[PDB]
Design a protein around this ligand. Sequence first.
Ligand SMILES: Cc1cc2nc3c(=O)[nH]c(=O)nc-3n(C[C@H](O)[C@H](O)[C@H](O)COP(=O)(O)OP(=O)(O)OC[C@H]3O[C@@H](n4cnc5c(N)ncnc54)[C@H](O)[C@@H]3O)c2cc1C
Length: 430
Amino acid sequence: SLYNGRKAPLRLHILIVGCGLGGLAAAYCLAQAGHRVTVVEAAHAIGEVGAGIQVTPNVTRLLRRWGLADAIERVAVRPEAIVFRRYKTGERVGYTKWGDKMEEYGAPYYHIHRADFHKLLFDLAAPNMTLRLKSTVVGVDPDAPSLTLASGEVLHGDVIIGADGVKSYVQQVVIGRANPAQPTGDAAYRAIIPTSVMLEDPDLKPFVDTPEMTAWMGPGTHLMAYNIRAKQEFNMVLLHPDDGSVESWTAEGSAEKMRADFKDYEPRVQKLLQHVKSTLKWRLMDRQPLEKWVHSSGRVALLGDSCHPMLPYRAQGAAMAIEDAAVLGNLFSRLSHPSQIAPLLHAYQNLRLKRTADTQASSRLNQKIFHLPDGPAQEARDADMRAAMELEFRLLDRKKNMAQFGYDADAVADRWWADVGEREIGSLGQ
Ligand SMILES: Cc1cc2nc3c(=O)[nH]c(=O)nc-3n(C[C@H](O)[C@H](O)[C@H](O)COP(=O)(O)OP(=O)(O)OC[C@H]3O[C@@H](n4cnc5c(N)ncnc54)[C@H](O)[C@@H]3O)c2cc1C
């Protein structure tokens, strides 16, 4: 029971465009808040798709609140540390202890396969939503409001939530255009190998025995690797200069070109990439924060990657989409009169926008540091990492980590409601 058992005295029909991690989180939170939810999804079925997702303590805190504590512990992995390595030799130049140290933010840091994460949120939301698959939204009347599907079917609701991802259709209706996207010059390969083949190699086995997030830093390139799916699968993300790619979750890369691009990395990376049977490739595109997330009619708003997508350096996409849902559901649990619908959507945006813009920036400002060419700049980064690492080992920015990881979406919305919203929004209609 979320919201201390409270249900909005005014029950809405809310249409959610997109059955991704955001849309499912929104469907769960808004149904719990006392609203009728329909989720409309383009995909014909939910598939075994996607790769590793970061579940930082600020996300885990909410998933535990939603009753998922055992189910996530079962399928996700708790990384013990983040380790930075020189590409060529595998020298460990950096180390930050995670594991139990992450519990000081009030919940564990998990690594999860997107499909396992999707399944957890799907099973939560499914009993309290109507899901329409094979239903591409191709039009929005933001005044009614209503949605138009590719079939021409029109769906009516009180509120439309656009959770339709990085290439949101709803975003174009809210803002009046697609948010400009600028190529960074880089692409990412994503590839998964079974950990059974690593356990068979005495040089690779320790990567399964002691689950870490390892970043090998190279000239123009990096390889980030970690266990998912209860250490049955090893997730690898490889950043490299864009030699032709598209911004799509289904676009393929050449495993042979991937191996060629990383041929100068240490022998354990050669052995890891030898097991890659296939790889998907994504063109990195930089997007700025939106000016607003709410349409001028106050009945359509955005959630998740539709309004704050970010680069894979600090992939907090899932985190920010789930936080968005928790705050939106918290505010909507308060609704008692139609005159409050717009103010509540404005409050949602007001509580979320700067935080998510700062989180996009945190990812954006990590693009060059792991890709330095060999030389003075590279040796100074390694030296700075070593200094920090040696303190970590003697025991055997933190304030930014606390601002990200210690965040409680419900606490922020409960406090705003108590200090301001009850008086300024709750009284509307009296
Ligand atoms: C198939 C898939 C695979 C992914 N794999 C990865 C990955 O490996 N690593 C990673 O970092 N991130 C991945 N992502 C993105 C990741 O889910 C997000 O960055 C974030 O975790 C959650 O954001 P979101 O729910 O706002 O958007 P998304 O997860 O992108 O979900 C948006 C949903 O909206 C649907 N949709 C889009 N347009 C319409 C429309 N017009 N009408 C109806 N439905 C529509 C899409 O089909 C999708 O299911 C993937 C997304 C998808 C859809």
